[PDB]
Design a protein around this nucleic acid. Structure first.
Ligand SMILES: Nc1nc2c(ncn2[C@H]2C[C@H](O)[C@@H](COP(=O)(O)OP(=O)(O)OP(=O)(O)O)O2)c(=O)[nH]1
Ligand SMILES: [Mn+2]
Ligand SMILES: [Mn+2]
Ligand SMILES: [Mn+2]
Length: 430
DNA sequence: ATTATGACGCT
DNA sequence: AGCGTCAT
């Protein structure tokens, strides 16, 4: 009871840009705004592969991973924007630069953890204490939360969406103890006020809309973020967790959407996150290991301790290209030419990174996949990265992989290569 | 022939 | 260090 930790110490938000690459293209080209549209890589094979989809297009069933030709069968008026190609490969620079715009705005409110190109966690605990002491016990007006949903509300004893949002928010605010500066629910609420301000700043200063989740930890904030997209934010309180998890498929929780989640379902004979509460911590550890077991035991009760890392920049800078089917690289000239193309993009990005961020990478990781290998990476080898020179990097990568050539003929490459990947790692301040 | 990344855990 | 999993 009084010593049962409840995981309510922190206020954590997850901010995620709505259909990010689409918004980047819609900002640049107003003709794409408020339209079914998608962003594609390449074009020759089945119209290119879709990697981002506007919400208008999602209404037609268009999704990520779809080929554009198939998407056009669902949505004949779908508009398409193509990712830039440079040196023979997709080049994602426009979206990385747009991401930096957003991350820099978020960093004005709190230290952030860059979790992806379009999302960041925020630890708002200190900012919340600040704003609470500024409020002087003054209640929080619904006007300060104009895009906020309170998960689980309204409940208890009109048929529009905005109306239900306002009803739930009213019930939430009516329940609040705005005189207790240590009340977790109040702290979350103030956190949501701050996130409204952050999201308003992002849209004002970039044109981009985003969604967000506000809760007591990263997993709940991420889950919350997904509940009311697009262009809305959602507060998931500690108290909302039993009902929310009672019908939550295990796979919806970050890190459980793959083999581990499938094993939780199969071994324990359960379907929903809430069903995990009936197992002891030692039972879960016995099935899933010490770390996973302890994490599951806490997470199904709404408790997770993973910190928001102070890290706004990516830890690695990488360049990769698949060579599927009959485009696989089968000669030395071919392998060397593509290693050079990748290395030239890497050099350009690394040199910009060194100028912007006062650091240098010291390790080059070279990854390949050979034809017929089921795995995504067939071989991974490191070497020293001592100079930002593409010709040196591509020569070193070749030197590191050259013995994977089974061909006695040195001019040919067998088995042909179906992927090349160069990654710069182990940054040091400079 | 979902492609291009990027983080992190294991041993 | 190199490999595997998660993510999208
Ligand atoms: N190159 C590449 N980029 C991807 C891939 N999957 C996602 N992305 C990019 C494009 C997305 O706009 C961006 C952010 O992904 P999200 O999962 O946050 O989805 P998105 O923002 O598109 O929509 P959302 O509103 O968050 O559901 O990442 C991929 O498989 N390959
Ligand atoms: Mn997004
Ligand atoms: Mn995202
Ligand atoms: Mn997505």
């Amino acid at each position: 009871g009084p010593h049962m930790a409840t995981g309510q110490d922190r206020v954590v938000a997850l901010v995620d840009m709505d259909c990010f690459f689409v918004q980047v293209e819609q900002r640049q080209n107003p003709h794409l705004r408020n339209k079914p549209c998608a962003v594609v890589q390449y074009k020759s094979w089945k119209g290119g592969g879709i990697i981002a989809v506007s919400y208008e297009a999602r209404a037609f069933g268009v999704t990520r991973s779809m080929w554009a030709d198939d998407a056009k069968k669902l949505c004949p008026d779908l508009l398409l924007a193509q990712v830039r190609e440079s040196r023979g490969k997709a080049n994602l620079t426009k979206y990385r630069e747009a991401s930096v715009e957003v991350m820099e705005i978020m960093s004005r409110f709190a230290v952030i953890e860059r979790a992806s190109i379009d999302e960041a966690y925020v630890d708002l605990t200190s900012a919340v204490q600040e704003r609470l002491q500024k409020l002087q016990g003054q209640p929080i007006s619904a006007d300060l939360l104009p895009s906020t949903y309170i998960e689980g509300l309204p409940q208890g004893p009109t048929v529009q969406k905005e109306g239900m949002r306002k009803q739930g928010l009213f019930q939430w605010l009516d329940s609040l103890q705005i005189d207790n500066l240590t009340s977790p629910d109040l702290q979350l609420t103030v956190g949501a006020v701050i996130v409204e301000e952050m999201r308003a700043a992002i849209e004002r200063e970039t044109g981009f809309q985003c969604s967000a989740g506000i809760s007591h930890n990263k997993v709940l904030a991420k889950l919350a973020c997904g509940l009311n997209k697009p262009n809305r934010q959602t507060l998931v309180s500690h108290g909302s967790v039993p009902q929310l998890f009672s019908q939550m498929p295990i796979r919806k929780i970050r890190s459980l959407g793959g083999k581990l989640g499938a094993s939780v379902i199969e071994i324990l004979g359960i379907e929903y996150m809430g069903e995990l509460t009936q197992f002891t911590e030692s039972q879960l550890q016995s099935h899933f290991g010490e770390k996973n077991g302890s994490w599951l035991y806490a997470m199904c009760r709404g408790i997770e301790h993973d910190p928001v890392k102070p890290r706004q920049l990516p830890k690695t800078i990488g360049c990769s290209k698949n060579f599927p089917g009959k485009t696989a690289l089968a000669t030395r000239e071919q392998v060397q030419w593509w290693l050079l193309q990748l290395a030239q993009e890497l050099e350009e990005r690394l040199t910009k990174d060194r100028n912007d961020n006062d650091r240098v990478a010291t390790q080059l990781v070279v990854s390949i996949r050979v034809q017929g290998d089921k795995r995504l990476s067939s071989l991974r080898r490191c070497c020293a990265l001592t100079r930002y020179d593409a010709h040196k990097m591509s020569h070193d990568a070749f030197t590191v992989i050259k013995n994977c050539n089974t061909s006695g003929i040195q001019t040919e490459w067998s088995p042909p290569l179906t992927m090349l990947f160069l990654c710069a790692t182990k940054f040091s301040a400079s």
